[PDB]
Design an enzyme around this catalytic site. Structure first.
Site: not given
Ligand SMILES: NC(=O)c1ccc[n+]([C@@H]2O[C@H](COP(=O)([O-])OP(=O)(O)OC[C@H]3O[C@@H](n4cnc5c(N)ncnc54)[C@H](OP(=O)(O)O)[C@@H]3O)[C@@H](O)[C@H]2O)c1
Ligand SMILES: COc1cccc2c1C(=O)c1ccc3c(c1C2=O)C(=O)C[C@](C)(O)C3
Ligand SMILES: NC(=O)c1ccc[n+]([C@@H]2O[C@H](COP(=O)([O-])OP(=O)(O)OC[C@H]3O[C@@H](n4cnc5c(N)ncnc54)[C@H](OP(=O)(O)O)[C@@H]3O)[C@@H](O)[C@H]2O)c1
Ligand SMILES: COc1cccc2c1C(=O)c1ccc3c(c1C2=O)C(=O)C[C@](C)(O)C3
Lengths: 254, 254
Positions: A148, A161
């Site tokens: 992230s 997180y």
């Molecule tokens: N979206 C964002 O803004 C964002 C920002 C920064 C980083 N990321 C990172 O990008 C990745 C994907 O994020 P996303 O937003 O696409 O996630 P998401 O939509 O919340 O989906 C989470 C996925 O992980 C699985 N999962 C959650 N908890 C689990 C557990 N205990 N065991 C096994 N599988 C589990 C879920 O399975 P189920 O469907 O079965 O629940 C689902 O497939 C993550 O590493 C996240 O931290 C996301």
């Molecule tokens: C300046 O803000 C950022 C600069 C860089 C990256 C991120 C952000 C956000 O504000 C932010 C807020 C909430 C979430 C995320 C982010 C993030 O990417 C995530 O990681 C996913 C999560 C934890 O589900 C919710």
């Protein structure tokens, strides 16, 4: 078709970035194991999209962060690979699944058990999955850790997180050095705020607030991040290892 | 064919990484301006390779770091683009040309004139080329600055070179924010030791010493770096801007 004959595991590919990643790896010709914990319908919808687009995939259920998780995942992975290929070779591991809810927890409210749950899923399980995966991985493989941009941008309500993503990125650094003699690359891909289909992304006012974090003044699409992961999975990334790859839409400009 | 209908300038593409980059951008369909300072024969050989492979390219001569350099380069570039396309659109700029030594300069021996020459070619010219290139550049363009892993790894006898790459990387940071509203991305790609065809790469004992700098224990090939540059030039990198992309073969692992 840059991944013909390759096998990939995308953890947490029932939805969000992991779904978009699984879809793109399968378009490149990979056989994709679509892993999930609970949302079987969503996993089945990822697989169905891959099958309709002419690719190959199968679901694997395993709750990460509990006893027997890695074992359970590899049982289903190896059975599915063997039935479809005769082999259990794992070319690509994407550590995408996470405890990653959009709700904050401000520092005063964090509990010991939330620290445990985030770390079990987001740091410990990726480490142990890498350890198990390399047994099956040929020289020339790919390990991609989804981090992230929060490891570089302070957001108090995501401290718990973010700690776990900081730990994940250490897996990248130290395991890239460890695995280099096998020609396995290990990299981090760091999303910013990315539309994963959650209800918050249906509220145009909140999405416009979220969009201000990006230099492009929009939230990311799942495919924006997945396109970067897909490149890293290919041969042409061979000279990138141990790296932090910013897939944030210009959110890490300070 | 990810760059069909696009026009690209690769500075210093008569030789080395720049030649490998021009060749790969042309394989994707780009019309490539092959820029050089004085080795016309080597430029004409890059162009001839691109033409034999089914692509389109033309040479552009301009010494950088002297009065009139940007004007001279853009005279040749725009004439060649207009002749071949009827337009002067520039989609992709790769700031690859640079001055260096075969074995650096000890800090005590660096002179003012050397600081000026390194600055003029490796930092000032790239800024002024970005400033002029964007006049021609549609929304969705690409600026790629070729840096060096030496901005992260102390090597006293490269202090003068490294100062200029530190300056170049600031173009990436600040121009990524500036140009984001146009959808133009700006990124740094940082090689490590890379075989550019120099005579030192024909000496197996020296190559084996150089090789130890990579986690993979080989020197980079020009194409290892050029493959990363090529990906950045494509649409699938759209969510990467302002980034430092390590294309060093794990040299910053130590
Ligand atoms: N979206 C964002 O803004 C964002 C920002 C920064 C980083 N990321 C990172 O990008 C990745 C994907 O994020 P996303 O937003 O696409 O996630 P998401 O939509 O919340 O989906 C989470 C996925 O992980 C699985 N999962 C959650 N908890 C689990 C557990 N205990 N065991 C096994 N599988 C589990 C879920 O399975 P189920 O469907 O079965 O629940 C689902 O497939 C993550 O590493 C996240 O931290 C996301
Ligand atoms: C300046 O803000 C950022 C600069 C860089 C990256 C991120 C952000 C956000 O504000 C932010 C807020 C909430 C979430 C995320 C982010 C993030 O990417 C995530 O990681 C996913 C999560 C934890 O589900 C919710
Ligand atoms: N090779 C490495 O180990 C290494 C390591 C880290 C970073 N890099 C960076 O990667 C880039 C490419 O390096 P390389 O090793 O491929 O370079 P190279 O083999 O030295 O080729 C230099 C190219 O730049 C042109 N050039 C040099 N000075 C010029 C000037 N004043 N005006 C205009 N053009 C000029 C040359 O033109 P002529 O052919 O006409 O002379 C040639 O096309 C550079 O930015 C370099 O700093 C390389
Ligand atoms: C620890 O060593 C490094 C860690 C990271 C990157 C590099 C190195 C080198 O040892 C090194 C030595 C000589 C040169 C370069 C490098 C280099 O990439 C270049 O930049 C180009 C130059 C100056 O022409 C010759």
């Amino acid at each position: 078709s840059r991944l013909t004959g390759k096998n990939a595991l995308v953890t947490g590919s029932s939805r969000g970035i992991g779904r978009a990643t699984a879809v793109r790896l399968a378009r490149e010709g990979a056989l994709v194991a679509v892993h999930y914990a609970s949302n079987e319908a969503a996993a089945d919808e990822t697989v169905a999209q891959i099958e309709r687009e002419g690719g190959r995939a199968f679901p694997v259920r395993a709750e990460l962060g509990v006893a027997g998780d890695v074992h359970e995942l590899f049982l289903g992975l190896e059975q599915g690979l063997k039935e479809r290929t005769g082999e259990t070779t794992l070319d690509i591991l994407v550590n995408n699944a996470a405890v990653t809810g959009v709700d904050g927890i401000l520092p005063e409210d964090v509990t010991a058990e939330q620290l445990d749950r985030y770390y079990a899923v987001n740091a410990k399980a990726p480490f142990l999955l890498v350890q198990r995966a390399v047994r099956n991985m040929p020289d020339g493989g790919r390990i991609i850790n989804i981090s992230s941009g929060l490891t570089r941008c302070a957001v108090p309500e995501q401290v718990a997180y973010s700690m776990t993503k900081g730990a994940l990125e250490q897996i990248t650094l130290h395991m890239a050095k460890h695995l280099a003699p096998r020609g396995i690359t290990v990299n981090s891909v760091a999303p910013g705020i990315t539309d994963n289909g959650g209800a918050v992304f249906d509220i145009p006012e909140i999405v416009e607030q979220m969009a201000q974090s990006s230099a492009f003044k929009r939230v990311g699409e799942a495919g924006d991040v997945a396109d970067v992961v897909t490149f890293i999975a290919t041969d042409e990334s061979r000279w990138i290892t141990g790296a932090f790859i910013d897939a944030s839409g210009g959110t890490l400009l300070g």
